[PDB]
Structure formats: structure tokens, C-alpha cells
Amino acid sequence: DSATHIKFSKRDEDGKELAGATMELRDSSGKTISTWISDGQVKDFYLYPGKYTFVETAAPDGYEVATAITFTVNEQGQVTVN
């Protein structure tokens, strides 16, 4: 199939984009397919059908590491979260 446009936002509790968070995107086997630090913008991804997980390795000071987020992209481009 084709790649589905995923938009990822790391934010504070006030809903503002938060920079300084070291992030990983992993595939269904746990392999890190993307690595980055948040910079205050929405981060774009394009994923083929499969199961993935956003994982935070380090939070900026004054903040707690969020629970990892597992989601699936199906053949019709629909995205289902936990």
C-alpha cells in the first residue's frame, strides 16, 4: 500500500508544543526506525501498514517521561491507538 501521513505532537499539559524531549519511533519488532529530539514543532512521519510505538527516552527538565504510545496503520490508511 501507500504511506500514511502521521503528525506527532509532543506537548506540555497546557497544550503547547514542548521542545527537548528525546523520542524514538519503533516498528512492530522493536527496531528504532526514527530518532529525534522535539523542537517545538509537529513532527511528520509517513508509515506503511503496521504496528508502531512512540517512545520517550528522556524528558526535558521539570517534566516526566510519558507512557509509550502504540498505534496501528491499516491498509486503508486508518490509524488506531490504544
Binding site: T4, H5, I6, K7, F8, S9, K10, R11, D12, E13, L18, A21, F54, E56, A59, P60, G62, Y63, E64, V65, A66, I69, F71, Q78, V79, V81
Partner: peptide, 12 residues
Amino acid sequence: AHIVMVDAYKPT
């Protein structure tokens, strides 16, 4: 499709 992850504030 959007995915939103929130960094919670550390305890006060």
C-alpha cells in the same frame, strides 16, 4: 492523523 504525547509536569 494526529498522535499527541503529553509531558506531564513533575510534582510540585
